[PDB]
Amino acid sequence: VGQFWHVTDLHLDPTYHITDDRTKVCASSKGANASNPGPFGDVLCDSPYQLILSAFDFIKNSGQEASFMIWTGDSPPHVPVPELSTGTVIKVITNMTMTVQNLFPNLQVFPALGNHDYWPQDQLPIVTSKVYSAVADLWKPWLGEEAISTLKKGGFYSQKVASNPGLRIISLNTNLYYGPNIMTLNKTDPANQFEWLENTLNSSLWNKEKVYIIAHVPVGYLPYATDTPAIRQYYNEKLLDIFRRYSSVIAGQFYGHTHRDSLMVLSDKNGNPLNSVFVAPAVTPVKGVLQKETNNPGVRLFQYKPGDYTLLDMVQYYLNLTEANLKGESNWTLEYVLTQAYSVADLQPKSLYALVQQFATKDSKQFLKYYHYYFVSYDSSATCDQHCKTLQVCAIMNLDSMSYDDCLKQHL
Amino acid sequence: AVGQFWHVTDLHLDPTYHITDDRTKVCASSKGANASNPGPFGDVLCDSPYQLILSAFDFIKNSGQEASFMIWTGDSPPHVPVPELSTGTVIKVITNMTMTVQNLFPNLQVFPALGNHDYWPQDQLPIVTSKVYSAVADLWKPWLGEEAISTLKKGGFYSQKVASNPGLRIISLNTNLYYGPNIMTLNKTDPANQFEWLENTLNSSLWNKEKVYIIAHVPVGYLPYATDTPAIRQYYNEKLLDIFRRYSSVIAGQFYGHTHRDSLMVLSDKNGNPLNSVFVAPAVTPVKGVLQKETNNPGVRLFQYKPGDYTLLDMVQYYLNLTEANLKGESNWTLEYVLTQAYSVADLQPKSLYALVQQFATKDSKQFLKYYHYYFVSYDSSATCDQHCKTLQVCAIMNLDSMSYDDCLKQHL
Ligand SMILES: *[C@@H]1O[C@H](CO)[C@@H](O[C@@H]2O[C@H](CO)[C@@H](O[C@@H]3O[C@H](CO)[C@@H](O)[C@H](O)[C@@H]3O)[C@H](O)[C@H]2NC(C)=O)[C@H](O)[C@H]1NC(C)=O
Ligand SMILES: *[C@@H]1O[C@H](CO)[C@@H](O[C@@H]2O[C@H](CO)[C@@H](O)[C@H](O)[C@H]2NC(C)=O)[C@H](O)[C@H]1NC(C)=O
Ligand SMILES: *[C@@H]1O[C@H](CO)[C@@H](O[C@@H]2O[C@H](CO)[C@@H](O)[C@H](O)[C@H]2NC(C)=O)[C@H](O)[C@H]1NC(C)=O
Ligand SMILES: *[C@@H]1O[C@H](CO)[C@@H](O[C@@H]2O[C@H](CO)[C@@H](O)[C@H](O)[C@H]2NC(C)=O)[C@H](O)[C@H]1NC(C)=O
Ligand SMILES: *[C@@H]1O[C@H](CO[C@@H]2O[C@@H](C)[C@@H](O)[C@@H](O)[C@@H]2O)[C@@H](O)[C@H](O)[C@H]1NC(C)=O
Ligand SMILES: *[C@@H]1O[C@H](CO[C@@H]2O[C@@H](C)[C@@H](O)[C@@H](O)[C@@H]2O)[C@@H](O)[C@H](O)[C@H]1NC(C)=O
Ligand SMILES: *[C@@H]1O[C@H](CO)[C@@H](O)[C@H](O)[C@H]1NC(C)=O
Ligand SMILES: *[C@@H]1O[C@H](CO)[C@@H](O)[C@H](O)[C@H]1NC(C)=O
Ligand SMILES: *[C@@H]1O[C@H](CO)[C@@H](O)[C@H](O)[C@H]1NC(C)=O
Ligand SMILES: O=P(O)(S)OC[C@H]1OC[C@H](O)[C@@H]1O
Ligand SMILES: [Zn+2]
Ligand SMILES: [Zn+2]
Ligand SMILES: [Zn+2]
Ligand SMILES: [Zn+2]
């Protein structure tokens, strides 16, 4: 099998620092006291460099052979806008990129921009900008001339996978569709990305290429909320239309942003599953004061069929933050292998569709395992009542507004 | 502020402890003798009731002293005849103490060391992997990385970084390999390869700019109440001291248990240069043999150190007045003394303690009278130490190697 790494939502806090005053440990705790801070971080803080470095060091010495890596964005930390700048955002993105380039000098890496990869956060523009030009220079070792051009202009690109003939990564800037982005309200095709996408998929079809879609913010519905698409409904519907029509060219979709481990199955209006969608959890464990849960840090690995790119498996690795802070050593370890964990043959839309049918059933243990993995095993005492469970299952299976409304109507 | 860490040792839980009319049934550890005057927190002829250990940890938890870590130097099973214990029962007691600690202090890194009772039969700790070594590796996994786990499983020792104190590394030796009653290690130059490993570890700490705390159960040096009786066999004491003297600029503290007493030692080179300070902490158990006239009150202690630096600033000894707690049926864990305050020294550096023990040596020194009262953790203010006793004490405090100690006894007995 071939395989590739997926990391996302690094969220470096350069001010991380263990000290007596726990309000003064990380700017990302937002002046609040870190709750239980260690060298690898705190649930109220974004990532210390030690955390991110231990993640990449684990990948490097994992004994796992991978031919590329996808990196779906969000490197700067959660601090107030006035505490950041264009210069500081570029500095953080540069530090992450150089960390990866130094540690992995021969691995092609496919980054996507996240909503924090810009100053001010979430305001990613539909024309060229300092941040887009900067990341185009930063990621030149991995991208051709045409990808550099589109990235500099709109924050998105496509690129052939050098080590995998017949595979192409499409890296979308889905922050253009993200609710908080006040730069793109009421535009029908912000930065022409839709027209660009269709052109690119059309060319991949005729060059007999397979396509992996990557982006930061995903399609579909936020699984913990009611009727809340991750991106604006209008853009979600239009993107999903493109994905459904090209579902035989697209062999996988990969997203981050939610900081959780979620599955989705893109389906038609009739219940034919068409593509498999994978939302990866964050390296940062950060949470607000009120939130009951957060994720353990996570990195993950995908296995696919050589020269074919059908997804065969996924391996989710994680770091137990409380224990790593307890002993002062990062024990990055196997959380689960998807096929083994859910007893499915592979990751094809059909296998996952049948597995989520099992999820639906009453007191499904499959769904309990899934819910425990949603938080990257942060808390097995976490529970999901039947309202919670309906919201989750309906978001997993129904990506478009009408399938989703029908699911909630029939099952809430 | 300053950094602080706790030291507990020799818990010696007796799970049979039990107030009943027949005082030969109060505790297996009295070995059928009549408990003297048993109360809820123990008896001088018994090992620790679980109520006593839990009161010690409860006091630590609710003391209002912050601490970034704890060291725990061994001996959890009680003193009962070998045929009354087993490997399974030893593991069961060790597990209970570990879980008690993890339950009350879930985010406190603890650094355990094995004691000579932490094995069945007692004292027979082996030089290869074993049921108990594996089990405690399992048990202590939350606090220890992969390399520590590997050495612990094989020989019962490890080193480990202090998560909360970067630049600090705990070395937990298994000195029971050197302990006279250990029949598994006779005529062995480096049992379980611990010396070789220790030297390697210290060399690594040198080049990684780490300071080191040595912890173990059985101490180096000479038993302060006897003549010419090293706590571990002479051959091993000399070898270990040679290592400690050579690395005494890297080692910022040594901490031991086993003697159930409050004792100081100053490791010195052959010319009296005080090199490195040694703290033997008294036990939680108050157990004593029938003929034995004195024993210790239960004790636990706290060390203060310079942050990012690990020079030792002070030590606070806390104790339980056993008779008082048993009289009312409620404990009152309380300050026995602060070392700088008790002895008017500036800190815990070798030079400061060296000067202090020079004062000890003077005739009718009040400093040494206070020290000898604290030796039993204040168990008897009428316990006295004649001039022979004093010479044994002072010479054991200052002279850890046989040559030094012989020289001291010659000049002063
Ligand atoms: C720990 O608590 C015990 C019990 O409270 C303390 O022992 C008690 O100490 C008092 C004061 O010395 C003793 O009373 C005195 O006895 C003599 C005659 O023996 C008498 O002349 C005095 O007027 C006074 O009554 C008392 O007997 C003794 N109790 C027991 C059970 O031994 C002990 O001092 C405490 N330890 C520390 C370090 O404070
Ligand atoms: C991550 O590590 C922590 C600490 O080592 C684990 O916390 C323990 O969890 C169990 C219940 O799940 C309790 O019985 C223990 O008392 C907890 N703490 C300690 C100090 O023992 C936690 O289980 C680990 N996470 C996972 C997914 O295994
Ligand atoms: C450790 O052992 C103690 C003492 O045996 C436990 O507390 C006792 O639990 C037993 C259950 O067998 C009860 O019969 C006793 O009444 C309890 N109290 C006393 C004072 O004996 C304690 O629960 C154990 N702890 C762990 C973590 O296993
Ligand atoms: C590092 O993490 C792994 C995974 O949690 C630990 O290995 C497991 O340890 C548990 C607890 O003893 C066992 O139940 C599992 O069977 C182990 N699995 C494997 C594959 O070994 C490992 O011990 C941890 N290392 C340290 C030093 O804490
Ligand atoms: C879809 O693509 C067709 C083929 O495009 C040409 O050939 C492929 C192999 C690529 O090299 C591509 O870049 C070339 O331009 C076009 O003939 C057709 O016009 C396209 N259709 C649309 C609607 O864009
Ligand atoms: C003493 O240590 C020196 C330092 O190098 C170490 O190398 C590896 C093994 C790690 O432990 C690393 O942390 C250290 O920097 C060695 O170069 C030297 O050979 C060692 N000498 C002896 C005699 O052991
Ligand atoms: C943080 O906790 C400390 C507890 O010592 C308290 O003094 C301080 O006021 C707290 N600050 C905030 C912002 O909660
Ligand atoms: C990135 O920042 C970290 C944290 O300040 C620093 O340790 C590291 O050297 C930096 N790396 C690069 C390549 O700038
Ligand atoms: C213990 O004391 C009881 C009651 O005074 C006495 O009958 C018994 O002989 C004593 N047993 C031993 C072993 O000393
Ligand atoms: O990192 P962000 O893009 S601000 O937000 C994405 C995730 O982290 C915080 C939010 O609650 C959401 O779960
Ligand atoms: Zn994020
Ligand atoms: Zn985001
Ligand atoms: Zn003991
Ligand atoms: Zn002992």
PDB file of N, CA and C in Angstrom, chain A residues 261-288:
ATOM      1  N   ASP A 261     -12.398  14.463  15.406  1.00  0.00           N
ATOM      2  CA  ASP A 261     -12.244  13.306  14.527  1.00  0.00           C
ATOM      3  C   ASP A 261     -13.632  12.938  14.040  1.00  0.00           C
ATOM      4  N   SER A 262     -13.966  13.326  12.811  1.00  0.00           N
ATOM      5  CA  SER A 262     -15.305  13.085  12.290  1.00  0.00           C
ATOM      6  C   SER A 262     -15.226  12.421  10.934  1.00  0.00           C
ATOM      7  N   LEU A 263     -16.237  11.614  10.653  1.00  0.00           N
ATOM      8  CA  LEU A 263     -16.454  11.026   9.350  1.00  0.00           C
ATOM      9  C   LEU A 263     -17.611  11.749   8.680  1.00  0.00           C
ATOM     10  N   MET A 264     -17.594  11.781   7.354  1.00  0.00           N
ATOM     11  CA  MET A 264     -18.770  12.160   6.584  1.00  0.00           C
ATOM     12  C   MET A 264     -18.823  11.308   5.334  1.00  0.00           C
ATOM     13  N   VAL A 265     -20.038  11.075   4.844  1.00  0.00           N
ATOM     14  CA  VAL A 265     -20.249  10.320   3.615  1.00  0.00           C
ATOM     15  C   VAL A 265     -21.088  11.194   2.692  1.00  0.00           C
ATOM     16  N   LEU A 266     -20.457  11.754   1.659  1.00  0.00           N
ATOM     17  CA  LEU A 266     -21.174  12.555   0.664  1.00  0.00           C
ATOM     18  C   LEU A 266     -22.115  11.661  -0.133  1.00  0.00           C
ATOM     19  N   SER A 267     -23.396  11.990  -0.151  1.00  0.00           N
ATOM     20  CA  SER A 267     -24.376  11.119  -0.774  1.00  0.00           C
ATOM     21  C   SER A 267     -25.212  11.919  -1.761  1.00  0.00           C
ATOM     22  N   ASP A 268     -25.894  11.215  -2.663  1.00  0.00           N
ATOM     23  CA  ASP A 268     -26.783  11.924  -3.571  1.00  0.00           C
ATOM     24  C   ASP A 268     -28.115  12.135  -2.858  1.00  0.00           C
ATOM     25  N   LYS A 269     -29.076  12.759  -3.551  1.00  0.00           N
ATOM     26  CA  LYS A 269     -30.379  13.017  -2.945  1.00  0.00           C
ATOM     27  C   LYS A 269     -31.165  11.750  -2.715  1.00  0.00           C
ATOM     28  N   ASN A 270     -30.644  10.614  -3.173  1.00  0.00           N
ATOM     29  CA  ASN A 270     -31.341   9.340  -3.139  1.00  0.00           C
ATOM     30  C   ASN A 270     -30.701   8.323  -2.209  1.00  0.00           C
ATOM     31  N   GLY A 271     -29.555   8.632  -1.612  1.00  0.00           N
ATOM     32  CA  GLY A 271     -28.888   7.657  -0.772  1.00  0.00           C
ATOM     33  C   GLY A 271     -27.996   6.708  -1.547  1.00  0.00           C
ATOM     34  N   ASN A 272     -27.323   7.217  -2.571  1.00  0.00           N
ATOM     35  CA  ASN A 272     -26.177   6.519  -3.118  1.00  0.00           C
ATOM     36  C   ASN A 272     -24.931   7.191  -2.552  1.00  0.00           C
ATOM     37  N   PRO A 273     -24.175   6.542  -1.669  1.00  0.00           N
ATOM     38  CA  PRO A 273     -22.911   7.138  -1.205  1.00  0.00           C
ATOM     39  C   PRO A 273     -21.912   7.282  -2.344  1.00  0.00           C
ATOM     40  N   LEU A 274     -21.226   8.425  -2.382  1.00  0.00           N
ATOM     41  CA  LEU A 274     -20.422   8.858  -3.519  1.00  0.00           C
ATOM     42  C   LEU A 274     -18.969   9.168  -3.191  1.00  0.00           C
ATOM     43  N   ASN A 275     -18.691   9.869  -2.090  1.00  0.00           N
ATOM     44  CA  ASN A 275     -17.327  10.011  -1.575  1.00  0.00           C
ATOM     45  C   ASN A 275     -17.277   9.958  -0.070  1.00  0.00           C
ATOM     46  N   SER A 276     -16.084   9.614   0.388  1.00  0.00           N
ATOM     47  CA  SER A 276     -15.742   9.561   1.791  1.00  0.00           C
ATOM     48  C   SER A 276     -14.976  10.820   2.203  1.00  0.00           C
ATOM     49  N   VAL A 277     -15.380  11.379   3.333  1.00  0.00           N
ATOM     50  CA  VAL A 277     -14.865  12.644   3.820  1.00  0.00           C
ATOM     51  C   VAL A 277     -14.291  12.407   5.207  1.00  0.00           C
ATOM     52  N   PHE A 278     -13.093  12.952   5.461  1.00  0.00           N
ATOM     53  CA  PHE A 278     -12.360  12.703   6.699  1.00  0.00           C
ATOM     54  C   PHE A 278     -11.954  14.018   7.357  1.00  0.00           C
ATOM     55  N   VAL A 279     -12.537  14.301   8.512  1.00  0.00           N
ATOM     56  CA  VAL A 279     -12.173  15.466   9.307  1.00  0.00           C
ATOM     57  C   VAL A 279     -11.175  15.022  10.382  1.00  0.00           C
ATOM     58  N   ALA A 280      -9.987  15.624  10.373  1.00  0.00           N
ATOM     59  CA  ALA A 280      -8.928  15.235  11.317  1.00  0.00           C
ATOM     60  C   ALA A 280      -8.881  16.144  12.543  1.00  0.00           C
ATOM     61  N   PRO A 281      -8.572  15.585  13.716  1.00  0.00           N
ATOM     62  CA  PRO A 281      -8.468  16.397  14.934  1.00  0.00           C
ATOM     63  C   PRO A 281      -7.164  17.183  14.976  1.00  0.00           C
ATOM     64  N   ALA A 282      -7.139  18.170  15.857  1.00  0.00           N
ATOM     65  CA  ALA A 282      -6.054  19.132  15.931  1.00  0.00           C
ATOM     66  C   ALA A 282      -4.851  18.575  16.694  1.00  0.00           C
ATOM     67  N   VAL A 283      -3.690  19.190  16.460  1.00  0.00           N
ATOM     68  CA  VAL A 283      -2.587  19.013  17.406  1.00  0.00           C
ATOM     69  C   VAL A 283      -2.825  19.840  18.664  1.00  0.00           C
ATOM     70  N   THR A 284      -3.332  21.063  18.523  1.00  0.00           N
ATOM     71  CA  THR A 284      -3.602  21.860  19.711  1.00  0.00           C
ATOM     72  C   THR A 284      -4.764  21.250  20.488  1.00  0.00           C
ATOM     73  N   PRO A 285      -4.710  21.258  21.823  1.00  0.00           N
ATOM     74  CA  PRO A 285      -5.828  20.756  22.642  1.00  0.00           C
ATOM     75  C   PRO A 285      -6.735  21.873  23.130  1.00  0.00           C
ATOM     76  N   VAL A 286      -6.537  23.094  22.634  1.00  0.00           N
ATOM     77  CA  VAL A 286      -7.107  24.267  23.282  1.00  0.00           C
ATOM     78  C   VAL A 286      -8.622  24.179  23.380  1.00  0.00           C
ATOM     79  N   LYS A 287      -9.154  24.722  24.477  1.00  0.00           N
ATOM     80  CA  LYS A 287     -10.591  24.823  24.656  1.00  0.00           C
ATOM     81  C   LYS A 287     -10.896  26.091  25.433  1.00  0.00           C
ATOM     82  N   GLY A 288     -12.130  26.547  25.313  1.00  0.00           N
ATOM     83  CA  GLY A 288     -12.590  27.609  26.174  1.00  0.00           C
ATOM     84  C   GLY A 288     -12.824  27.135  27.597  1.00  0.00           C
TER      85      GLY A 288
END
